């Protein structure tokens, strides 16, 4: 569970926002890309795994699950690539709510940035720092630190 991440792809302003969610904490990293390709997803996962101890990734769709480039990145970075089938049905809704929340924050900051990518990173910041009382950023660190002492 400390190593489990979920991929999530959402759309805004004719562009694609690719999100990785650390399932146990709600912590996220995100990027804007022109379109969701295997190459973009692979590069995104490589970055993520160099930054956090990513053991398992629930991929966001079948094309990324199948993609030989995504598979090569997962092999390179030591990531187990799994499907993202919500056998647990509350998973869909949690992701849906996060996309709506992220888009709301993006709208609240949108005017402060000339480019969408900046607004997205501002939203990542606000999301990870928001105290719910611990923040997502605090929860991911504690979960992984606990796991290292083990």
Interaction site with ligand IY7 (CB under 6 A) = 37, 39-40, 42-43, 46, 69, 72-73, 76, 112-115, 117-118
Residue 118 found at the interface with a second copy (CB under 8 A): yes
If the CB atoms of residues 56 and 118 are measured against ligand IY7, the closer one turns out to be 118
CA neighbor of 77 nearest in space, from 52, 58, 49: 49
For residues 134 and 41, give the distance between their C-alpha atoms in angstroms, rounded to a whole number.
30
To the nearest 10 degrees (0 to 180), the angle between helices 68-77 and 38-51 is 10
C-beta separation of 98 from 68 below 8 A:
no
Residue 21 found at the interface with a second copy (CB under 8 A): no
The answer for residues whose C-beta is within 8 angstroms of residue 125's C-beta and 6 or more apart is none
Choose the contact partner of 69 out of a second copy, ligand IY7, none; CB within 5 to 8 A by kind.
ligand IY7
Choose the contact partner of 70 out of ligand IY7, a second copy, none; CB within 5 to 8 A by kind.
none
If the CB atoms of residues 109 and 141 are measured against ligand IY7, the closer one turns out to be 109
Neighbours of 73 (CB within 10 A): 24
Question: Which H or E run contains 2?
Answer: none
Which chain residues interact with a second copy by CB under 8 A? 29, 43, 46-47, 49-53, 76-77, 112, 117-118, 121-122, 124-125, 128-129, 137-138, 141-142, 144-146, 148-149
């Amino acid at each position: 569970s400390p190593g489990i991440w979920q991929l999530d792809c959402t759309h805004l302003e004719g562009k694609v926002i690719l999100v990785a969610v650390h399932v146990a904490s709600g912590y996220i990293e995100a990027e804007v890309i022109p379109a969701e390709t295997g190459q973009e997803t692979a590069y995104f996962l490589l970055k993520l795994a160099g930054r956090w101890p990513v053991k398992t990734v629930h991929t966001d769709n079948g094309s990324n699950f199948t993609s030989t480039t995504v598979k090569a990145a997962c092999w390179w970075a030591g990531i187990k690539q799994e499907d993202g089938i919500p056998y647990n049905p509350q998973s869909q809704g949690v992701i849906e709510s996060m996309n709506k929340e992220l888009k709301k924050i993006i709208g609240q900051v949108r005017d402060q940035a000339e480019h969408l990518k900046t607004a997205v990173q501002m939203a990542v910041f606000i999301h990870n720092h928001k105290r719910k009382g611990y923040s997502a950023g605090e929860r991911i660190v504690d979960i992984i630190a606990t796991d290292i002492q083990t």
